[PDB]
Design a protein around this ligand. Sequence first.
Ligand code: NA
Ligand code: NA
Lengths: 247, 248, 249, 249, 247, 249
Amino acid sequence: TPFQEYSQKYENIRLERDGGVLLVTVHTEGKSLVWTSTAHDELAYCFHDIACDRENKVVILTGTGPSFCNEIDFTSFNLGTPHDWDEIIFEGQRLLNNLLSIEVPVIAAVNGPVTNHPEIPVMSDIVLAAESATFQDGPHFPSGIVPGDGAHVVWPHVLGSNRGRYFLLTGQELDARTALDYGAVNEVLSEQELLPRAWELARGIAEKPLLARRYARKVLTRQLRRVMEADLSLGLAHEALAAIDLG
Amino acid sequence: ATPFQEYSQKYENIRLERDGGVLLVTVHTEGKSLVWTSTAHDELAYCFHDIACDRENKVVILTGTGPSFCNEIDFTSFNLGTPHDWDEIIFEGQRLLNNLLSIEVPVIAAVNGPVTNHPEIPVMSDIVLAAESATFQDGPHFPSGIVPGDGAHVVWPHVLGSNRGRYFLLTGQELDARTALDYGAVNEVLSEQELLPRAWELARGIAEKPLLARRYARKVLTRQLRRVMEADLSLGLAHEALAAIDLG
Amino acid sequence: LATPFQEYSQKYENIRLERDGGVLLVTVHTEGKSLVWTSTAHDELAYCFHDIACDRENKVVILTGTGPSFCNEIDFTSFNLGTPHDWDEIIFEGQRLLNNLLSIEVPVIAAVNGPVTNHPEIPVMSDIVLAAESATFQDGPHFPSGIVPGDGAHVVWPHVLGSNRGRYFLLTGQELDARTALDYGAVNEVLSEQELLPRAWELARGIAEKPLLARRYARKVLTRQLRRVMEADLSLGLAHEALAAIDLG
Amino acid sequence: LATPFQEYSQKYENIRLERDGGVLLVTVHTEGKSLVWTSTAHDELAYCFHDIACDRENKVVILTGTGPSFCNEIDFTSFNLGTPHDWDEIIFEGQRLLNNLLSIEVPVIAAVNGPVTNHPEIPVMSDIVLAAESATFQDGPHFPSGIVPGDGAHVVWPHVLGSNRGRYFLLTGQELDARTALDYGAVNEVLSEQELLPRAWELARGIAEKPLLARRYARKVLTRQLRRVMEADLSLGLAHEALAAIDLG
Amino acid sequence: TPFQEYSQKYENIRLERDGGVLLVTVHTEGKSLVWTSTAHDELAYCFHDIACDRENKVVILTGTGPSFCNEIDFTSFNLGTPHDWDEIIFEGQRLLNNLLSIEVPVIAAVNGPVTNHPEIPVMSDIVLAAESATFQDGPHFPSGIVPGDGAHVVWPHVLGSNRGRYFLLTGQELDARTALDYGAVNEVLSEQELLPRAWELARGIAEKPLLARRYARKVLTRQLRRVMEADLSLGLAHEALAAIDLG
Amino acid sequence: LATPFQEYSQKYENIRLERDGGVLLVTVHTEGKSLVWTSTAHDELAYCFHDIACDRENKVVILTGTGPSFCNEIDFTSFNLGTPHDWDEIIFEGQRLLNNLLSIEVPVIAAVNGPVTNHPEIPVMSDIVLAAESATFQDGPHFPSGIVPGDGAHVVWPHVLGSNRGRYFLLTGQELDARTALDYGAVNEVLSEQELLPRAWELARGIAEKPLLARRYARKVLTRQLRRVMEADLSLGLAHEALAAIDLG
Ligand code: NA
Ligand code: NA
């Protein structure tokens, strides 16, 4: 399906493309994204659309306003039965598997705090953070929920073994410069410079030969793909069991 | 299945005290800093098995006592000369680290001071706390003419990264507390006085979480270490044994 | 029978090989100045690593360069990059370059005397990495040049720098200076130019004085994961690099 | 929102899609005759497998052909095989074809109604494989035709036949008849032409009666190793296939 | 724990040793084993005791009476909640991982039908079967239960991809000669010849040098151990979720 | 830099090497009679597989023996098996033997002319396995002689026979005749004594007619999983075999 169709399918995702550089901006009515079942499932479907559309040369992922995503509407999720958890398991797999199936480089521009699926931006090939960006996993273990949704794969992968486990268990908040030092972020920029820097990088990548661009991505995500396939759905099933047990 | 009342008292080098589901494991020799021996080695393998099988452990703290975690060894306690003798070390060495990984609750290390004997054990924990005086060093392997094949070869490159881990194992580098912190092997550096109180504080917090959340967090976090340990540990041990036997 | 040191030490116009008390010093050069990367040098290193690996009298290896750069110049006219024919020779010898490097069964110490832009992954594949204050690492010949980083750069850099530092390094043409490489953990020690080789020799002598099987098996037990990821991903990388590059013509 | 069945069931000129009691019958064809493999059919199957995977009202899938052959003719003129960027369309969609198939999370039954020589690995990736007496399996369009079997053939056939039978099948153009495929363990049941689809329906109805999550998670727990090796090896094979094919002009 | 402690510990497992060959006979009051949660957990602990006892040179695993194990006391299991299923998951992991931790060769002598954990005998290094032996997975998919307890790992591993998946979906019964042809079984014997043959092969193994016996087992179980670590707990969590959904 | 066929073809006393139209016939022998396994022969085969792999004019390989047996005699006095020193040489060359074989990048055909009891895994690692009616396979020199089968036997036999058949074969000293090996899928064709070499040549000539890159890449995509398990498990096996053997003293 062509850009003109899918670019307007998503209430929580603005999609704008210029010169084959796709800017994907998550949002709730134009304010910082409030995480919902709807935003979750839209991102999974949107990632699929982006991946299937060859005219996307490079992807920039960002939020809007003061936060990337640090608010949630728990009333929007059904977390009580195996029935409802299989819906979450199935689209949770597609969320991260569709992200990794995108075959062009992905740049994150983290504009502010993220506490819901904070692993998504740090799965990108280039990670840029505003001075105010932070990363934190409060909705999992600090809230009595298994970090089994990809968090358990990605954070030890990107922070290393012990920083990753500690981050996940203690609710540590990583600010922009700590994330930079831990190697999860590549550049810290003022808020005003963040998106211009993403576009500059993206344009440079977009100028490279078609197949060079596409294959850079493919050769660079091999190990992440292997560990996601190994551990993601095991995490999700365990997180589901633990969550159902609360009732 | 062995009850806490029995196993808590069966280990001469491991004090085992539980309060509100938090198990404090203190390694020691006659109430001073642990002297590494064949007996301590095997006791820890069996003890980790017992801990793993006891579901009333909600969270574990591993610590030492006195000025050192474990930086002295009694080499005369080990039979290192024949394959027969190495097979018992290989078998219990696999059990030492696999039984540790079979523990299905979060594990916190509180490293009270220098560790040179199996220093990989504390850094395999989910949370790593260190005293200011804590140090890590693999002197008993390559600096002493012995292959670091007992798990040191899996864990140090896993936790420090490829180049730091290989260098650490080949040069006898001593990591002080703040270098280990910067390298990401340690999470917090505390004064000696603050170390255990902080370990307790983190442990009590974890222990409050729901039963399956606590358990499955540990399970979902240790996948990659378990894969690499299964892939590489036995290979390391057999090679270390071959090389050691050659020495005589 | 194996090729004896007396033979292979004199086989390679771009690789000097000096053995002193079992410590083998491998110095890459172009007529006694800093190595200029060529097809010849590429293939020589692949064959040389095999000869080194098969010679058990090498107790420890030090890899270094000469002059102000380790290798940051190239002779573009020495390669043929236009046809699948051209590329199968690069694929085949490129696989042999890194696999033969990894087949060396003693510890390898790198002493990075200056900038490296051509196969900079080679030094950082070493068990001990020492760098002069002036050393740098950069991957300009790949992506900043419109070429896929699939010749092993895609394996080694994310492995040694970590996932995000590695991918960023490969996509943006980032130059790592010595102290940044040290902080990122790709380098173990930064030394003055005058102290670099002396330190390499010091560490190398210390390893060479360990018992025979101990040193031989240390390398083997320490390179398992790198060997696993190289076997999984190297050829995939090279074939994709080859396709992308042929497409340009 | 997912594409509804009422829409996607009519979108594919080479794939008939009929559903009853949650059993989805997927019949591949060309103008109602036995399927002729083309670029169109190849990509349609990739898209269709994605649509089937995303529609959770598919409780079980039966995959089958029509007429004397499952698919034993190919129109090579429908593909562009001469340049890298044309091969990237095939690499991309080729990956989707097999990965989308594996992303289907209900059990898949193949009903092989006669000879298959093009993508014969598709039906044998199924969880249950039924064959008519006249079914055969052969990989002639790859190696016997001077083309690398790198499109998934190299993964699936060694995986389902075993190492040596798989390699031999792919290098010699061996044709497996139904009873041989049965004995090799690629086929589970050989039926007369009249009993084939009735048996597929019998088995599908049985599966469809099982509880929702049991049915879904059965597929998932059973395809782990196949998924591992496809991820590890598919793209490698495709790039190598492309390089070799391009060199051919 | 030496043999004289654990040899009498298990109500459903008789243990006898002759020339260091351990014969493990599963039974219920001296009749064919009736599967229960007790028998399940006793096997798991027993396999640990066997693995840790270096005076076991070789192991023979068999049943008694007409069946190896084709009856069950469905009332003995608690399959209603996640925390009840964590019991089964934890111990199901131990059952198969403790089996694989045994570091001497294991011979199965399948005396008749097995339908409850039939994967156990075929995990052995040598599999001998009486003419009357059969193998079938009725209790999983034919009963609306996910075959995720290790069935999913072992049967595709031993039968091959397609025979394995088919066996697990259709409730196919493999008779002894089919199991032989499929490679799950090495020898089919008359009932009267089965145990003598097991003893003969075990004694032949026992004659080899200590470390040769032990290391033969260790180098031969590498691949099974790898797939079991990759996939077992994934299967058990999903089986648990699907089973809880049943009420 | 690669040794040309003119040099290496005459370098091995136990390996006759002849090439016609790019088909390389590798015949193992002791003084023109059936090969007797020795340290010399083991080390020669390792060196020879490296020469074969590096020589691109080899389009396809036939591996065979001479006389009534492929290799069913051994000279145990030619091996040093007492010390860790002795065994590290065996480990090192045992790794090179199987890894050099797998480094060969063209299809390999085995023509097994009779019984093989020494390193029987070698022929069954081939892409096509042909057996005379008199061929047999057996691993008597390992476990039936009180030695761990840790030299690659432990990898290859479960890989090619399946899990239970592989383990049984290695523990019991089972002898597989030609028809059982065929049924088990280790062998692809059983031929009469007179038809074995004619058939191998016929298949080799057909493969050699294929396009250059397709031939070369066919091998590479077909040996992925064997390479992965060999890397995972070979050295572990050898070290444990060494430990057990040394203990025998
Ligand atoms: Na750092
Ligand atoms: Na068969």
